[PDB]
Amino acid sequence: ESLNEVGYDDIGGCRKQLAQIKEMVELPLRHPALFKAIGVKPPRGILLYGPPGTGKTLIARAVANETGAFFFLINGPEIMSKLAGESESNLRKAFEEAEKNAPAIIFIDELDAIAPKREKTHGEVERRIVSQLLTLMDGLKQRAHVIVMAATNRPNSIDPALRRFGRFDREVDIGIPDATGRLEILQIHTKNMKLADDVDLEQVANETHGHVGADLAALCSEAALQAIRKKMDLIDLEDETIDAEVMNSLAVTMDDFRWALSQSNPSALRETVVEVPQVTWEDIGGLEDVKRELQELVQYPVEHPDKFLKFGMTPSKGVLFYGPPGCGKTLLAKAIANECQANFISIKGPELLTMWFGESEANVREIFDKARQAAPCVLFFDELDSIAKARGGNIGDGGGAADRVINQILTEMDGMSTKKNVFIIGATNRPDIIDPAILRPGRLDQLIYIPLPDEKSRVAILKANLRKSPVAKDVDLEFLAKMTNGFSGADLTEICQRACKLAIRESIESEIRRERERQDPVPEIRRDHFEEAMRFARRSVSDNDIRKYEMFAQT
Amino acid sequence: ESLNEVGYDDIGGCRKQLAQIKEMVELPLRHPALFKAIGVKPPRGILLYGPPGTGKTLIARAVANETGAFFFLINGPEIMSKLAGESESNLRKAFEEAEKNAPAIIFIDELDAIAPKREKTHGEVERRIVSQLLTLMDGLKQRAHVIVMAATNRPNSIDPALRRFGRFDREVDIGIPDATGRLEILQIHTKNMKLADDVDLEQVANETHGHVGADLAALCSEAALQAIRKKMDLIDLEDETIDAEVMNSLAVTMDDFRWALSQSNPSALRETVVEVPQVTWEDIGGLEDVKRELQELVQYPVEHPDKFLKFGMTPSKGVLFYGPPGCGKTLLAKAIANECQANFISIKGPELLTMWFGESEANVREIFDKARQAAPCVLFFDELDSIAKARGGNIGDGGGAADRVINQILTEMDGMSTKKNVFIIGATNRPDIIDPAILRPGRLDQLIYIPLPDEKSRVAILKANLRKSPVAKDVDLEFLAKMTNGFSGADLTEICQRACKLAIRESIESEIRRERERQDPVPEIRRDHFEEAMRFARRSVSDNDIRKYEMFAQT
Numbered sequence A, B: 001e002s003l004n005e006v007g008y009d010d011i012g013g014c015r016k017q018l019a020q021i022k023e024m025v026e027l028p029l030r031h032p033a034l035f036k037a038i039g040v041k042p043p044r045g046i047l048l049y050g051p052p053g054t055g056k057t058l059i060a061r062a063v064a065n066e067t068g069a070f071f072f073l074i075n076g077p078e079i080m081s082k083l084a085g086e087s088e089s090n091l092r093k094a095f096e097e098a099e100k101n102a103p104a105i106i107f108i109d110e111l112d113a114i115a116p117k118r119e120k121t122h123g124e125v126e127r128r129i130v131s132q133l134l135t136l137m138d139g140l141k142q143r144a145h146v147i148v149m150a151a152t153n154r155p156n157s158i159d160p161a162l163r164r165f166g167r168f169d170r171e172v173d174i175g176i177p178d179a180t181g182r183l184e185i186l187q188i189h190t191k192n193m194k195l196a197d198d199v200d201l202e203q204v205a206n207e208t209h210g211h212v213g214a215d216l217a218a219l220c221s222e223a224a225l226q227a228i229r230k231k232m233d234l235i236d237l238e239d240e241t242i243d244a245e246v247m248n249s250l251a252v253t254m255d256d257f258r259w260a261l262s263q264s265n266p267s268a269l270r271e272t273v274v275e276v277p278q279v280t281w282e283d284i285g286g287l288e289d290v291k292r293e294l295q296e297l298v299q300y301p302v303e304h305p306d307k308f309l310k311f312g313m314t315p316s317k318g319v320l321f322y323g324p325p326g327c328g329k330t331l332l333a334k335a336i337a338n339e340c341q342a343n344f345i346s347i348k349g350p351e352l353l354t355m356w357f358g359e360s361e362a363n364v365r366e367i368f369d370k371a372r373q374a375a376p377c378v379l380f381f382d383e384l385d386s387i388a389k390a391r392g393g394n395i396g397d398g399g400g401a402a403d404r405v406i407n408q409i410l411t412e413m414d415g416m417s418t419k420k421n422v423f424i425i426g427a428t429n430r431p432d433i434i435d436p437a438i439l440r441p442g443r444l445d446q447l448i449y450i451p452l453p454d455e456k457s458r459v460a461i462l463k464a465n466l467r468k469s470p471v472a473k474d475v476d477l478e479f480l481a482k483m484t485n486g487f488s489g490a491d492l493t494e495i496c497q498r499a500c501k502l503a504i505r506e507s508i509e510s511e512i513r514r515e516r517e518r519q520d521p522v523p524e525i526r527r528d529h530f531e532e533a534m535r536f537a538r539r540s541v542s543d544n545d546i547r548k549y550e551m552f553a554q555t
């Protein structure tokens, strides 16, 4: 029991949301004698939600065991899997036992089974359970201490009748650990194990992009199992290989981790992921003027709210970055979030276009909701033009300047204009085609013209992109940028990448030669590799698009 | 019990509808001895409806406890959650007990559960309950006093068989508290609590736009809990921190309220909200001629109905404001409602276009119904052009001058021509593209040409928009407007906003400088800021659109 027990230390990598859950159900359970009636009624509707496997059960077990309670697990498909007439009996038994003990936490796991969407529970026998749960929750009002948590996979699957007020109304999120938190999950899941040095858990966490909770645990599991396999030749003692002699002389190495990290851990979950971006303004060369104009709207108004009130001005929410493709718009919108700690819930052009092509416009209403429950966040809708481009060309050419997605967005953004925590960044590459209504007061107002990087900006961005990689001495990333006068951002980066390719070849080539001669030559990128890469370099976004975007500078 | 009891004072912020409910079920319950047969049969079908959480249960408890009765709560999903054969037994038991006592109110909460739409209750066992309820209601006819209220989330979810006459036929609304009523809800929910001064509940209510009832209660709850948290360092006495010494020295501050107001109260409900607008004709500079022509049709005909009868003229319902984009059309239609107390149920262009793109034309029939139950109201359909614009350009270009939304509107408006309380204001920005049938007698008739603000109008509107904000002395908003001769409304406002931005920077900049020098400079907007803002100012709606709209002046 104690070997795999739970606590506030076992749960790791998700502290922002664990803080909310704790502070919700730790003060009214550790110090409930004040009863909260001196203040307000305590929470009674916690509805932890997240993708299958994120620590939802572990979080509840930690918040229960740590703050002494009477955790009574009511695993979802076990009250609905006990014939007819016994589901209600078991629910009432569990809740009456919970209230019998003064402190209590009732963790209804997989609430989608007990309480699905009401239009999907055709069977009436499965509907009596939902209604009984609703009435029992209503009866929990003013009952001693019956704080009840739920473990729905997604909050939209639960019956809305449960998600009202008095019932579940404290919907907290438990998102996918983006980075630097999944490393913590791996640390807690590996402290009992033996890491055989060279185990850069930081790199393992950085590589995993989508793995949630038990998936990272299974990654570590397969790493340990691969360590065992590599000794299988030494463990091949059919009788008694189980002896500790061939066991304790084992520990996971970097390659053992990698084998499962890349190949044998295909299981993963992909979706809109809230993430505190790692890129910083130091990583963005140039763009000083916009860097200043992007502080007047998201860092200064929040740092001095009183000044924006006495004078009187609704802060301009909804900057609409418009510039040549690949000019740091995404990098800028991630670095701003890095400055002011926030969640960069991005919605790229493919994700927006999938709803117009698939006619699934309702999903948009969830995106903003995901932003509503992840505040303070950013809503970098990238390539708003995509829907109109698919519809045709200039001025649509297949109808008007509207669509089935950016029209719903025009309503959700208006609704979110009340929320004073969520910025709505748009990054249309071609601005003369977006719906004009997304440029009106209240909605997206400010138009920051991310310019084509100027020569100084080219030098700065080339230096920034050549930071994590060796750059050598005579490379001279000063005149190298001067040869480029209209290159559009990424392309310059590509050049650098191309160099790091056109260079690495030589290295690895020499490497194989070092093998033939056996039967590192200037690792840093030399000017020869950069010249060879520039030999095939393209000025993406011809001057036509540059002057077209300048044509939108009139607005 | 008495601590959280209910009465006509506990319910607050919704008095217009509470008045109807009271007057319906207060005279036939407090003085029923006349039996109403001396007059007419009393109401027997109250069907309180509103978004989940608005005081629906509190309103019933107030109207029951205050006017002594026998409130017998029949919470929806508790008669349908008691096996088979006991639902009808419980309903009959409750109603027979209600009639046993002379006075009685039966508050069927969440009627959607007991009585859903008949096409969604596939299970027959859930259909016997609806039919039993219908028959029992029919038997309540001439029964002593069995006034029965319902708490459906939305009246369309209930079976129409219940909404007929003799059965539920007194469908009253309980809408989202718009403003100045939610402040009252907060006051009632905070009187027992301690507001630590500086708690501008007016501002808190003004900020919340969509919060309903229990959501504002939860806002206050989280404010109090945050006040407790801020003392957590002082409340950190694991043994006996519950002592009143560390409690009574607490009270909610402005920042504690704000933390939940902006960040930690994401829960909210958004929909078409009936609201008595706050903008007044004093806030609209210029537009005198239309201000007079907009009194001949909504204030004079209702102030002197007899004159419009003897002479003989159906008052022209359906003004169709047509002018350059952003020229006070919405402001005018809100100020008119502010003058004659009404409900400004607005339907913006995105909300109209969402039905054409989504092919959900039936929803229109609800909008007018929402207007029918919110009379006297206004129906400011903004940007009727939007649907045609999405369909193409001039004269449609993708077919005819019709559509799937403005065609249904052409029928609902004809049906509503009988209702002598609801004005139907249209605000198409481009008028040469709306369906011609919306310009015919009976339907929208009058065409008020909101003109491009003239120089005097520019001065007036600039002065009005610079009212809530400091304006200084030498700013001289007289020649400042003279430099603008074709600016279209909002743009001038934007200039002012731009100034209040281009000014505030300096202030906050000086502020941070005041910090560096430590290791307000002319707060009022100076002419320098206005000049800088005008340096980047655009004449929205070029003269082409002006002369195009003048081309529609021929009609």
Ligand SMILES: C[C@@H]1CN(C(=O)Cn2ncc(-c3cc(F)c(OCc4nnc(SC5CCCCC5)n4-c4cccnc4)cc3F)n2)C[C@H](C)O1
Pocket: A297, A298, A299, A301, A302, A305, A306, A308, A309, A312, A313, A314, A315, A316, A317, A336, A337, A340, A341, A342, A343, A376, A377, A378, A419, A420, A421, A422, A423, B206, B262
């Ligand atoms: C009668 C009344 C009077 N009345 C007024 O007089 C006007 N008024 N009174 C108060 C404000 C106000 C509004 C804000 F929205 C705000 O922002 C705080 C904030 N917190 N976190 C972030 S995001 C942060 C940065 C990046 C994203 C992730 C983290 N922001 C932020 C900053 C800038 C823009 N958008 C959000 C602060 C404010 F003071 N306006 C109101 C009404 C018209 O009528």
Ligand SMILES: C[C@@H]1CN(C(=O)Cn2ncc(-c3cc(F)c(OCc4nnc(SC5CCCCC5)n4-c4cccnc4)cc3F)n2)C[C@H](C)O1
Pocket: B297, B298, B299, B301, B302, B305, B306, B308, B309, B312, B313, B314, B315, B316, B317, B336, B337, B340, B341, B342, B343, B376, B377, B378, B419, B420, B421, B422, B423
């Ligand atoms: C044989 C018969 C003879 N016959 C007639 O001879 C003609 N006739 N007899 C009576 C009327 C009449 C009609 C009205 F519609 C009316 O309006 C009252 C009203 N109350 N509230 C508001 S809205 C108010 C303002 C803003 C919105 C929110 C609050 N209005 C209002 C005002 C102006 C326009 N629309 C509604 C008053 C009337 F007298 N016409 C009728 C028939 C053809 O055949």
Ligand SMILES: Nc1ncnc2c1ncn2[C@@H]1O[C@H](COP(=O)(O)OP(=O)(O)O)[C@@H](O)[C@H]1O
Pocket: A010, A011, A012, A013, A014, A052, A053, A054, A055, A056, A057, A058, A109, A185, A188, A212, A213, A214, A215, A217
């Ligand atoms: N955030 C986390 N921290 C530590 N362990 C986790 C986390 N998330 C998931 N796990 C691991 O995944 C397993 C199952 O957790 P989870 O799937 O969240 O609960 P449930 O299976 O009840 O949904 C546990 O054994 C736990 O060790």
Ligand SMILES: Nc1ncnc2c1ncn2[C@@H]1O[C@H](COP(=O)(O)OP(=O)(O)O)[C@@H](O)[C@H]1O
Pocket: A283, A284, A285, A286, A325, A326, A327, A328, A329, A330, A331, A382, A383, A427, A429, A460, A461, A464, A465, A489, A490, A493
């Ligand atoms: N300082 C910088 N300025 C501009 N671009 C940069 C900078 N640093 C890196 N980049 C590159 O610019 C690209 C930006 O692409 P992005 O603007 O997101 O494209 P899109 O706007 O089409 O989504 C990135 O792929 C990144 O590699």
Ligand SMILES: Nc1ncnc2c1ncn2[C@@H]1O[C@H](COP(=O)(O)OP(=O)(O)O)[C@@H](O)[C@H]1O
Pocket: A165, A166, B010, B011, B012, B013, B014, B052, B053, B054, B055, B056, B057, B058, B109, B185, B188, B212, B213, B214, B215, B217
């Ligand atoms: N108009 C209102 N005035 C005062 N309190 C309200 C109002 N609306 C909601 N509430 C609060 O919300 C809680 C639940 O009310 P409500 O949701 O309307 O009833 P029900 O939960 O039966 O639908 C109550 O405790 C009450 O204090």
Ligand SMILES: Nc1ncnc2c1ncn2[C@@H]1O[C@H](COP(=O)(O)OP(=O)(O)O)[C@@H](O)[C@H]1O
Pocket: A441, B283, B284, B285, B286, B325, B326, B327, B328, B329, B330, B331, B382, B383, B427, B429, B460, B461, B464, B465, B489, B490, B493
């Ligand atoms: N007195 C006034 N006259 C004209 N416009 C004003 C006045 N006062 C404020 N405004 C501004 O004019 C705008 C009106 O926009 P609106 O006509 O609703 O646009 P649309 O017609 O496209 O819906 C508002 O945003 C408001 O800020």
